């Protein structure tokens, strides 16, 4: 009886793991796309600031 | 008559003397083997223009002679273009001789004005059972076409011309915005095979415009100009219901931010141009339905770097009123068309648009294709036999429902050997209002594989065994 | 109306679609762009004329403006430069999910995050 | 020197106790609770009550929620903060501990919730 | 002819002549000072006006001191005579033991061989480092790389090379310093006489120095490493020996260009290098080859950013490169020193008609088993290390004993540790290796590795930690 109460808990258990994995995996690939965005933003000022003052 | 001053890679400077173009015009240089068009865009003052070419730059001296047409860019349009193959400024491109018609027309014009608008929405049937029923198409709205190659995505181009010449009488216009001359060949000879296209006589239902991948980023912006004027000579002098290809819309909108770049501009946020909102203005307010007649227009879009906040597809969804996607998942199933009927939106399916006879029909398709797709794991798991009884019967319905979208096409009647079925509204909505509710539960599964209407479904099971 | 002793009411629709044209204008008369590469006065555009929408007192005739305007964010980014330019302006804030839009509650309002700080003491006591 | 040696004894472990909890929410959030040692189910189990204990109904915010706006002396904010260090009130839930004023609204809070 | 001087900004000097416009890349004299001032032209402007660079400083500099020219580049001596001297830029002895007396005087600026005056053969050069060796090997005649980022030993690493390799070496050998700091320039100078390669009494030297360090000008540090290899070329070309040519650093060659670029009117190109930044790198790395004149070992020391090898001053440099040891601090900051990664390290001639069948099927059995090891971190961070099996608790074991195999004693960083200095022979680096693979050393702990030289020091160290339990 423990042999089966111990392996259905290590299912439930591995499965919880892998929803709160896959819900935080969402919200650090919005705030990956907005940092993809600023930087290509960002670098772009730096070379028409640079042209313009020249 | 100018001069050109200025040759900086694809970009002229003209000087001219006392008649001084204005912005949008069109000229052309004196001396050249092909013609090559410039597009004044700028007035820099001291009597000199700003234009972007149309072609290749090289060879051009500092003060050779520019004409001027005294009008925009101004293409051969008419009945008699369909079925013949255009670039940008209406030159033929097939060596089957120049077309020959009526009148022309100019690309750059302005919209439909506020009085002339439709004041209700209404839909487009296709004769498609998955498009009709769960994804509807609205008259005149734009629709966005989410898949690539490999899933079957040029039949279902090839079969939507095919279904509105019959139960509509409109043809259609192809524009091809900067695409690969290897993939718009295979698209002429594919035409060519299934009927839609004709070299022998009057009965072609379609005009193709190619703006092909290797030509000066003023002269792939400008194509899907050129293909929406053709579009608007069957509406406005003839009253059709015309559709619109756009294939695809991404490369409108990159082919954009090249020319605004080379004019000398400060980019706005990716790399993009300051006007991105604007472009998108300026041409997808001129597809609409007037007091005439409508256009409606179907493309495809494809998302850089799986980012759908990038302003690049952010700035289109804001036009957009039905997306179908295509998955690939549904094609190694073996149904055809390959359309998802979870992952499709449509914005009028509505109760006070489309009725309630269309709504909760619908509506409960979808709800049981839920089921079906969360019962699948436990069953996949841990097994089979310890679910209930009451959900055995939605186990067996949505492989039912989910095979009864399947539909064989008038395209492909060589192939599959099968007779091509164009299935009206009111079927549609017939048949699945009687799937949902057990009433013919009782009958095989491959009765339903690859029929008409459910007429034709009952007709299938008395051939097994 | 508000002078002359009327009530008004007026609704912008957008206020995100107006600042990406105050962003054209901007940068084609070459002036620094900055933060997603918006000019330096934003907050002068929409403060400028957000401010207009007031009551006078009993003095003035008694009428009264009121405005709600309308942002646009991308996937939930209430953190962005514009939608934090019009927070802090406004007494207030109406939030619309978009995960509960498809769930079948509708209208979404997000109760947890709808706040309304001056026009609590002004409803009816019935309610 | 300033303040004095218990204000800034008491005011170092309250800033102790809430950095190891900051070090544990990468393996609460994937591993659940039941992973912890026994002892680090009471760094998790107090600074879940320090944190309760850092908020006050403010004397302006009557209108927002109809609450008493309360004030503490100086006194009596470092009584509070040694009784949960110690561990004298580890019989209480935490939402007793939430939005009160001084140590001695908590007690007469948690006999509601019985 | 002379000129006069009609602005100054920066480093960047503007000098407008009136009848005789010398050509870009010479030399111009500044008269009026009590130190030697030489300007190098960069660009013309027209109206017989160009723009140089200074090569020492612009202080107390008027507008309209009379500026001679020389009708050439800067022409540094060279020689035999130079053996044994620290020299500047344009060639003045800064050793302060007199002039430098030779015959030859050399420009720094000349062109590049041609195809056909190409040499083609390899070979391999033994060092004595366990982990260069065996995975990525040097080879005569030709450029050798060293990366990673500040402070993991670069350096040393490059003093370790002149330790074994050019005291055994029969020709001369050059040691040109780039943009480093000037104490280093004086514990080379002092551990270089102790060990009698600089001689300062006779004609028995086998060492030239060439310094311009990091409190010079940014239009002198651009300048000295090729003055290095004009004298390393005068070795392979008029004479005919094996010459070797160490260099660190060569990141500070990229940086002073982008310092005096946005004054000489360019547009910046990405991160902030400037536009011409591919092309004069490509112009000193192909003087730095074997012809058919002579042979010139290098090897290189190359900082890398702020640990980012997608820089594109450092991620440019490949291309110029045979043998690449990448150094990393993610194996630094575990105790292992060399840090050098084994599986970011390539070279041309690992190659299996080249280096035998035997050591190529030993070097590719490290780089599987020790990849097979990275991916099983991933399991033990949420199973734990007891509930693996038996299977892959024994290909831990076994490549943790090659993690800890890799690193040897080094002979100069014994002022860091007092362990003595191992040299282990390529026959003996193979042989080691095997036996670790093949499990015939599974009954030791993993310290009987640790800093070791030979296999045959891991079992003597076994049983001296066993008997103080
Ligand atoms: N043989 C060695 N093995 C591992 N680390 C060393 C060795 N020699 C020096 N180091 C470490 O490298 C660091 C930097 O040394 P050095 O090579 O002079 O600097 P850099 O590589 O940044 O020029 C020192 O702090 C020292 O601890
Ligand atoms: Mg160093």
Do not use: C, W
């Not at chain 2, 379609?206 to 002269?219: F, H, I, K, R, S």
């Amino acid at each position: 009886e423990s042999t089966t109460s111990e392996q259905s808990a290590r299912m439930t258990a591995m499965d919880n793991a892998s929803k709160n994995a896959s819900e935080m995996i969402d919200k650090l690939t919005l705030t990956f796309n907005r940092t993809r965005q600023a930087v290509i933003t960002k670098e772009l000022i730096e070379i028409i600031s640079g042209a313009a003052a020249l | 008559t100018g001069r050109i001053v200025a040759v900086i890679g694809a970009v002229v400077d003209v000087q001219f003397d006392e008649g001084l173009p204005p912005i949008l015009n069109a000229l052309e240089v004196q001396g050249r083997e092909t013609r090559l068009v410039l597009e004044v865009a700028q007035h820099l003052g001291e009597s000199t223009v700003r234009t972007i070419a149309m072609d290749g730059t090289e060879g051009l001296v500092r003060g050779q002679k520019v004409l001027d047409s005294g009008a925009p860019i101004k293409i051969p349009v008419g009945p008699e273009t369909l079925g013949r193959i255009m670039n940008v400024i209406g030159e033929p491109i097939d060596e089957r001789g120049p077309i020959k018609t009526k009148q022309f027309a100019a690309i750059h014009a302005e919209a439909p004005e506020f009085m002339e608008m439709s004041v209700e929405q209404e839909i487009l049937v296709t004769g498609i059972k998955v498009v009709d029923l769960l994804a509807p198409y609205a008259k005149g709205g734009k629709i966005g076409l989410f898949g690539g190659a490999g899933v079957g995505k040029t039949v279902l181009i090839m079969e939507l011309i095919n279904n509105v010449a019959k139960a509509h009488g409109g043809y259609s216009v192809f524009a091809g915005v900067g695409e690969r001359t290897r993939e718009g060949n295979d698209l002429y000879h594919e035409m060519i095979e299934s009927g839609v296209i004709n070299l022998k006589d009057a009965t072609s239902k379609v005009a193709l415009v190619y703006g092909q991948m290797n030509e000066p980023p003023g002269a792939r912006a400008r194509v899907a100009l050129t293909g929406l004027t053709v579009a608007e000579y069957f509406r406005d002098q003839e009253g059709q219901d015309v559709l619109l290809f756009i294939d695809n819309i991404f490369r409108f909108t990159q082919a954009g931010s090249e020319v605004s770049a080379l004019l000398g501009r400060i980019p706005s946020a990716v790399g993009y141009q300051p006007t991105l909102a604007t472009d998108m203005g300026t041409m997808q307010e001129r597809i609409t339905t007037t007091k005439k007649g409508s256009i409606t227009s179907v493309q495809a879009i494809y998302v850089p770097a799986d980012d759908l906040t990038d302003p690049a597809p952010a700035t289109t969804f804001a036009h957009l009123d039905a997306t179908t996607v295509l998955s690939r998942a549904i094609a190694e199933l073996g149904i055809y068309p390959a359309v998802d009927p979870l992952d499709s939106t449509s914005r009028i399916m509505d109760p006070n648009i489309v009725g309630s006879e269309h709504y909760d029909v619908a509506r409960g398709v979808q709800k049981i294709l839920q089921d079906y797709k969360s019962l699948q794991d436990i069953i996949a798991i841990l097994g089979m036999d310890e679910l209930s009884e009451e959900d055995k019967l939605t186990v067996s319905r949505a492989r039912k429902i989910q095979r009864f979208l399947s539909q064989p096409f008038q395209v492909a009647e060589v192939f599959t050997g099968h007779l091509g079925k164009l299935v009206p509204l009111k079927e549609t909505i017939k048949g699945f209002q009687q799937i949902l509710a057990g009433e013919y539960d009782h009958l095989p599964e491959q009765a339903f594989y690859m029929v008409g209407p459910i007429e034709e479904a009952v007709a299938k099971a008395d051939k097994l065994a | 109306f508000r002078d002359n002793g009327k009530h008004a009411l007026i609704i912008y629709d957008d206020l995100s679609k107006q600042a990406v044209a105050y962003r054209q204008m901007s940068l084609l008369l070459r002036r620094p762009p900055g933060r997603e590469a918006y000019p330096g006065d934003v907050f002068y555009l929409h403060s400028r004329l957000l401010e207009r929408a007031a009551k006078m007192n009993d003095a003035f005739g008694g009428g009264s403006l009121t405005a709600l305007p309308v942002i646009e964010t991308q996937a939930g980014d209430v953190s962005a430069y514009i939608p934090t330019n019009v927070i802090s302006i406004t007494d207030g804030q109406i939030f619309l999910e978009t995960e509960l839009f498809y769930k079948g509650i509708r209208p979404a309002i997000n109760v947890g995050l709808s706040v309304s700080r001056v026009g609590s003491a002004a409803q009816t006591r019935a309610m």
